[PDB]
Amino acid sequence: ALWQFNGMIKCKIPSSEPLLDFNNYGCYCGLGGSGTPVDDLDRCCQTHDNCYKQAKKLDSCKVLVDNPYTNNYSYSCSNNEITCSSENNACEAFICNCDRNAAICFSKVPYNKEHKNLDKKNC
Amino acid sequence: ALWQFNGMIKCKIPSSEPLLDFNNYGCYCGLGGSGTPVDDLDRCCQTHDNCYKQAKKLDSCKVLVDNPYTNNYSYSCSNNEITCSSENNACEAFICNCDRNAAICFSKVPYNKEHKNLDKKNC
Numbered sequence A, B: 001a002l003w004q005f006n007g008m009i010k011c012k013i014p015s016s017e018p019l020l021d022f023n024n025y026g027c028y029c030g031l032g033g034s035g036t037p038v039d040d041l042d043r044c045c046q047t048h049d050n051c052y053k054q055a056k057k058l059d060s061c062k063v064l065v066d067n068p069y070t071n072n073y074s075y076s077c078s079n080n081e082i083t084c085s086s087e088n089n090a091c092e093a094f095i096c097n098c099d100r101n102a103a104i105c106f107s108k109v110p111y112n113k114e115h116k117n118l119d120k121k122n123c
């Protein structure tokens, strides 16, 4: 879920607007992604893009015809930790977990200014 | 939020369909409520109805023109405890808290079969 992923990263990184700060970073953070991750942040993005690919092959996901970016799930942020809810259907829960791991990855890795708006010439 | 309150009570009482089991119980559990609570469950319902009344007087609530029953907020259920999310606006957070306290109250009090579909002749 885009609105929930944005919220998740803000839970971990309260000073950020994730849709601005983390969009179009490296080869993978943003729409698509190809090539070799340029750093560990971009590698968090590659893992999350693979988590969505895997979510897409799941039998449960084959119904909710809301790409993982508009498929909404339920979670909490409290005390800056994210909890995915037991209320989620199997597809929703799998996606909530991809998002949670990515938000956590993003908070633990360097941010490299020079890889933001990375020109795709060698992704 | 009705859909989230239902979920909250199921978080606390996993064997229930709360919209069936707790609707129209006593004088307060359900649409409105007047009179003296018939037992402690009904009294949980009176406290929750007063929590909604108080939510309604709040300055923040005066905008979201979705009565507290369709005003959606975010929460988690995990390990059978409810967490209201820091992502909630002040109105949403106040309502999430009314709901959470009521769900918890409902799980700690007797259920009296004889007060379900209570005829309103003396509420």
Ligand SMILES: [Ca+2]
Pocket: A027, A028, A029, A030, A031, A032, A033, A045, A049
């Ligand atoms: Ca990507």
Ligand SMILES: [Ca+2]
Pocket: B027, B028, B029, B030, B031, B032, B033, B045, B049
């Ligand atoms: Ca009531």
